[PDB]
Design a binder for this molecule. Structure first.
Ligand SMILES: OC[C@H]1O[C@@H](O)[C@H](O)[C@@H](O)[C@@H]1O
Ligand SMILES: OC[C@H]1O[C@@H](O)[C@H](O)[C@@H](O)[C@@H]1O
Ligand SMILES: OC[C@H]1O[C@@H](O)[C@H](O)[C@@H](O)[C@@H]1O
Ligand SMILES: OC[C@H]1O[C@@H](O)[C@H](O)[C@@H](O)[C@@H]1O
Ligand SMILES: OC[C@H]1O[C@@H](O)[C@H](O)[C@@H](O)[C@@H]1O
Ligand SMILES: OC[C@H]1O[C@@H](O)[C@H](O)[C@@H](O)[C@@H]1O
Lengths: 138, 138
């Protein structure tokens, strides 16, 4: 297990992938969350280029936080995460957007509001155990 | 620190108090949660007599879960929890309702939908550290 909340310094550009392997701590009936935030600084109060929040069994919200203010929330009812199971989450930086893979299935996209080069830190937190976190590049 | 999620077997009646001392894991800007659930069984999928969820800095929701279904949500914008600080949460069983004290201040009430004698387990979880959990009686 990696500690949760998990914070890692990171640089992203086109071709960067962020891969997370984890498991919800409790059954989907109890609505555990997962959050992944791409921050502009190492401090947790810093702006968020890309905010990804799963309410397991219900929905996903995505947003940015810019100069401390939450922007236009995007919502998906797409729920490929399986009750009780380990997940593999992969977030890829494409030229125009983030691609979110769940268990090898394209599940969510989010157009760049801020250049991904603004990211200095990824935080993974809320009601999961974390087995793997990797930032990679092709 | 007590492990989180924290689960303790419990019996409640009029005069029972549940006291929790904890601290949010992150700043209120990032909206950490605290949840306290009074369950009818030791298993986490069991019905919830009393569901208390803090979104720190934003709101509190309270509900019951009966035969697996969430009932009428109650919402309060009362927020006596302090950014960055340890809290003391005390939930008292009165004849007709739960009384929720935060840092010695009456903050929330919730009329009994199910007799508090139906409770067999308390779960404390989401984005907190936990220093104390006690079930007591006067
Ligand atoms: O957790 C913080 C939440 O605050 C809301 O105001 C935002 O619109 C959401 O996107 C975000 O998930
Ligand atoms: O933004 C959400 C969309 O992202 C796409 O890349 C996914 O493949 C679709 O399933 C989904 O509708
Ligand atoms: O923020 C824009 C994103 O929002 C989604 O609603 C669209 O379906 C995605 O294709 C797009 O990348
Ligand atoms: O976390 C579970 C949530 O599900 C909602 O449907 C309920 O009305 C809330 O009271 C509860 O907080
Ligand atoms: O249900 C909420 C109410 O509970 C009362 O016991 C509190 O003292 C009030 O501040 C609050 O309006
Ligand atoms: O569920 C009923 C509870 O809801 C609140 O709106 C009331 O203000 C409380 O006094 C009451 O105990």
């Amino acid at each position: 297990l990696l500690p949760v909340p998990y914070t890692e310094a990171a640089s992203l550009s086109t071709g960067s992938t962020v891969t997370i392997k984890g498991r919800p701590l409790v059954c989907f009936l109890n609505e555990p969350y997962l959050q992944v935030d791409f921050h502009t600084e190492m401090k947790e109060e810093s702006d968020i280029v890309f905010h990804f929040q799963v309410c397991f069994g219900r929905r996903v919200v995505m947003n940015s936080r810019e100069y401390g203010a939450w922007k236009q929330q995007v919502e998906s009812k797409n729920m490929p995460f399986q009750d009780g199971q380990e997940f593999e989450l992969s977030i890829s930086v494409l030229p125009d957007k983030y691609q979110v893979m769940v268990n090898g299935q394209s599940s969510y996209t989010f157009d760049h509001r801020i250049k991904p080069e603004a990211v200095k830190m990824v935080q993974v937190w809320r009601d999961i155990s974390l087995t793997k976190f990797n930032v990679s590049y092709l």
